[PDB]
Amino acid sequence: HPQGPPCK
Amino acid sequence: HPQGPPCK
Amino acid sequence: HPQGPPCK
Amino acid sequence: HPQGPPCK
Amino acid sequence: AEAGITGTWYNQLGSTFIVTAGADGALTGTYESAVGNAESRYVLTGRYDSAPATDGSGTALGWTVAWKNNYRNAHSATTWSGQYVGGAEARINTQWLLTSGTTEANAWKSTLVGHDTFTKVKP
Amino acid sequence: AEAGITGTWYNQLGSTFIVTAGADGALTGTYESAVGNAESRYVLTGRYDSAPATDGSGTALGWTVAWKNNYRNAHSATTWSGQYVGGAEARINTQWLLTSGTTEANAWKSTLVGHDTFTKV
Amino acid sequence: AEAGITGTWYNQLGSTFIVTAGADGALTGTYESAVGNAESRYVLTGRYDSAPATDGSGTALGWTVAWKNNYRNAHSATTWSGQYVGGAEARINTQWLLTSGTTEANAWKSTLVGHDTFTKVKP
Amino acid sequence: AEAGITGTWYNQLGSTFIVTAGADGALTGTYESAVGNAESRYVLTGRYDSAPATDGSGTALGWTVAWKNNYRNAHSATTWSGQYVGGAEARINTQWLLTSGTTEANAWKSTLVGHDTFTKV
Known part of the structure; x- marks a missing residue:
């Protein structure tokens, strides 16, 4: 989701 | 409050 | 999840 | 309310 | 779909929402x-x-109302977050957060939570 | 102060918010x-x-973001409700509701709730 | 009053709550x-x-259920906060928070919110 | 760790919580x-x-407190829902719902929502 932190 | 019902 | 309705 | 901070 | 949402809606407390x-x-x-x-x-x-x-x-949506106009100022704002579900009986089901402006000390109790369902009445 | 809300804010997750x-x-x-x-x-x-x-x-406010743009559509929307406090360390303290478009059967777990504090640092 | 709350209740999703x-x-x-x-x-x-x-x-109340028993473990807990309203048609109106155990990174989306109304069926 | 939840916790308001x-x-x-x-x-x-x-x-948990004791009755109750994270700096991160006993007419604004982080310091 764009609301969360990076997926990195 | 304008978000609640009419008063008494 | 046990808090929701029966499955399909 | 007892849940809030002190009234001090 | 934009049309479906556009119109007049009322909720169970008797409030009116007119949206485009x-x-x-x-x-x-x-x-x-x-x-x-x-x-x-x-x-x-x-x-x-x-x-x-x-x-x-459903179609996710949300809106905000700050409770100030030319007659009143309730120093608060509410945001409704929910989904539009169409059909012959279209509804908008929401959960809302009403936040009041408080001082530091009452910040802990500045927000109320509830839920409202809106029924469409006119286009 | 009043139009002190204008500017660029950051939250603890790394998201940036630019408002007027x-x-x-x-x-x-x-x-x-x-x-x-x-x-x-x-x-x-x-x-x-x-x-x-x-x-x-503080100053009560709120805003919405529908998670769709010309590259992505996450079929959801978030509303933040909170208040702005200005001063040397201005902050916007919020609680938010993220609702996803679901089918009836999944409607009971359509909404997440959380809180974010935004600052200009 | 304790009696009034004691009994069996059901909500609109079909779940059963038996309380004393x-x-x-x-x-x-x-x-x-x-x-x-x-x-x-x-x-x-x-x-x-x-x-x-x-x-x-109404009478304010709240309860918690951690979703683990001898058959299943959904690694989550829910708390219902609401009011008991008695009468011939007694109801318990609540708002609930369902929190799942997550790692650091998904903590932001660990909690769901909703509302349920319970109808009393047996004492 | 498991029974690391046992002990005395404090939140940012000054409240103390002692659990087993x-x-x-x-x-x-x-x-x-x-x-x-x-x-x-x-x-x-x-x-x-x-x-x-x-x-x-983290470990999911929750608890309730009815605001009545032999000296006070605030006709309300609070439920905290969250998770425990242990380690060098253990914390219990929560969101809570405080409902007051109201009459029908005031039922729409019966519940407040907030968040608390508890630590052993």
Whole structure:
């Protein structure tokens, strides 16, 4: 989701 | 409050 | 999840 | 309310 | 779909929501308090997701109303987050957060939570 | 202070929020997500209360972001409700509701709730 | 009043709540998932405020269910906060928070919010 | 770690929470309010999930406090829902719902929502 932190 | 019902 | 309705 | 901070 | 959302809606407390959904995902309109004459109208702005899914899924949307107009200022704002579900009996089911401006000390109790369901009445 | 809401804010997750507060209560801007990215930007619109009380209270406001742009559509929308506190360390303290478009059967777990504190650092 | 709350209740999703209110403000019982055999029972504990007001006000209460039993473990817990309203048609209106155990990174989306209304069926 | 939930916790408002976690999921204890006071203590009861997952996840739990004791009755109750994370700096991160007993007419604004982070410091 764009609301969360990076997926990195 | 304008978000609640009419008063008494 | 046990808090929701029966499955399909 | 007892849940809030002190009234001090 | 924009049309479906556009129109007049009422909720179970008796308040009025008049909204127009524009093709770019915007929501603009007015919100009126439950019964109570004409000057109980406030401006609202929001957004909806203009390309929902096929299926029988709802369209997510949300809007905000700051409770100040030329007659009153309740120093608070409410945001409604929910889904539009169309059909012959279209509904907008929401959960809302009402936050009041407080001092430091009462910040802990500045927010109320509830839920409202709106029924469409006119286009 | 009043139009101190205008500017660039950051939250603890790394998201950036850029807003313009109008003199009559409007809030307009862009919310950009993870990595900074390029089109991790979404439009946001809201309202704030342009005549807050004069007891050191914060300014009530809120805004919405529909998670769709010309590159992505996450079929959801988030609304943040909170208050702005200005000063040397201005902050916007919020609680938010993220609702996803679901089918009836999944409607009971359509909404997440959380809280974010935004600052200009 | 303890009696009024004690009994079996169901909500609109079809789940079962069996509770006993003790004179000291305690709440103990079992919660069952919507339809679904016998092993869909979980333990619940809560508290209610045993001396509400006269008036036609509700009795505040709340309870918790951690979703683990001998058959399943959904690594989550839900808390319901609401009011008991008695009468011939007694109801318990609540708002709930369902929190799942997540790693650091998904903590932001660990909690769901909703609302349920329970109807009493048996004592 | 498992019964690391047992102990005395403090939140940012100054409230103290003393709990005992049982091996089967129970949470029992006392919640004391402002000033420390003497009978600012209220009973709390809850549950936690005694077999959390093995991906570094926190432990889901929740508890309730009815704001009545032999000296005060605030006709309300609060439920905290969250998770426990242990380690060098253990914390219990929560969101809570405070409902007051109201009459029908005031039922729409019966519930407040907030968040608290508790630590052992």
